[PDB]
């Protein structure tokens with residue numbers, strides 16, 4: 001029923017969505033552009049509107065992230081609020097996906113590794129990194 | 145046999161999570177508050193006094209409208225909280241139990257002195273409800289009611 005979603009204000013969500021699709025393996029990408037009619041209403045050209053995003057979404061590791069363009073109204077993305085992806089180390093399907101995702105992302109030039117993804121002394125796995133847009137991601141594997 | 149599904153949680157870096165947790169308990173009606181303080185033994189390891197460690201938080205959680213928020217102290221390492229990443233609470237307008245809780249929560253929070261209303265919580269032309277506000281810590285919350293009845 002009730003669910004929480006981060007809602008990110010990107011400078012350009014069109015670019016950011018292509019980045020997550022390529023670097024993070026993001027799936028189910030949906031993007032609502034500023035319509036040709038809406039261009040005049042917002043105060044932009046036909047081309048500027050085609051590049052702009054009203055509302056968007058993408059799934060990373062089966063979790064949904066919502067986003068929209070800043071339109072010069074939002075603050076720059078920082079690490080004050082990080083996105084933690086929690087998974088059960090005893091759920092093979094998810095555990096393998098997290099493994100594959102990290103394997104594919106760990107060496108990427110856009111990714112800044114804060115804590116390499118690894119098994120922690122008291123249990124589970126924990127990894128921390130920041131992407132080129134400044135989003136801080138934390139991968140948290142727990143034993144339930 | 146029993147497994148949990150993958151879930152996303154915001155992880156907030158507060159200057160003081162102890163204070164912030166009391167604020168959410170009081171102003172937001174936050175429930176299931178759990179706080180792990182810096183232990184007396186850990187104080188020396190962290191480079192702080194016994195008192196400073198009792199006030200400090202290593203890990204914490206709280207529920208608002210049945211959704212979980214994680215947090216920890218900044219310890220001067222994290223950036224100041226802004227609206228680059230907002231927290232959207234999504235619910236069904238046609239689920240009376242949840243709809244009433246969202247209504248009651250908003251009614252209780254709208255007039256508070258800590259709360260800055262960006263968009264009053266209201267029905268939207270194309271369907272559902274939407275409301276937007278920022279708290280004293282700079283967290284931007286969005287309330288979003290969805291109608292799953294087709295337009296046609």
Ligand SMILES: [Zn+2]
Pocket residue numbers: 030032055056057
């Ligand atoms: Zn959509």
Ligand SMILES: [Zn+2]
Pocket residue numbers: 120123124125126140141142
């Ligand atoms: Zn852990």
Ligand SMILES: [Zn+2]
Pocket residue numbers: 178203204205
């Ligand atoms: Zn806990």
Ligand SMILES: [Zn+2]
Pocket residue numbers: 271272273288289290
């Ligand atoms: Zn809506």
